[PDB]
Amino acid sequence: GSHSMRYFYTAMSRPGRGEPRFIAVGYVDDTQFVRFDSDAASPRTEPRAPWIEQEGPEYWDRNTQIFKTNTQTYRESLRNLRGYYNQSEAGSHIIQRMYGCDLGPDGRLLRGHDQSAYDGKDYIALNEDLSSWTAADTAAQITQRKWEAARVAEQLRAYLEGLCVEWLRRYLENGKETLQRADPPKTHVTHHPVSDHEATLRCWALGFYPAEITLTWQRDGEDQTQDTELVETRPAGDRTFQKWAAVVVPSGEEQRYTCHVQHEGLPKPLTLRWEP
């Protein structure tokens, strides 16, 4: 019953290959619902979830004016930050930003976030007080002085505590059939000999929403953390996610191993074994 909204901005320079591309995508939890790409043939905010389509032309207009304004603003920030690092005009660089609001199970604001990165390193972040900044280095201290002068933290606190939360709550209602619905994993255990002495047990979770899950192997009731091969949670392309966890076990000590599954969508946490 906990929910969040995030917007992800990526601005990428490309000297010799035109002006920097600006992309913005908006999510509620693991569901994308809008995009804007300054490289699209006709750059506009586009819906990416059915429940956002009902929004009126006023809403799509508003979105598009912010993202075009940001397209320009980020092109200057890229110019600025290249200077802050005394960088050559030859190189391609990236600014990323992620911000939004986290709601608790009650629907109250748990916390706000606003972070920025430059070339994949933390650059500046609004602190949890929503009033002050943490700058990673002396270049970001320049950005900080500018953001203090324009009272940016004040403005972001107002949005994060206000509009961000109201809209997320609007979206959760309009998309309630999917956004407020958790789909439990479908699970099984596969067994493959890798030798005459040992065999791999792979525990599968499929079809789950949202992405957050915990998959653990235990031997005689204790975690095999270093011995577990854990693959990254991957999207199916139908809104759901997949994961597995494998262990290599002495043959046949297979019964001493249990796969443990936790997911928000489950009746109870699950315990599985290989069923020959």
Partner: peptide, 9 residues
Amino acid sequence: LPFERATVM
């Protein structure tokens, strides 16, 4: 809804 203010870095 996205944050409405663009600010230069």
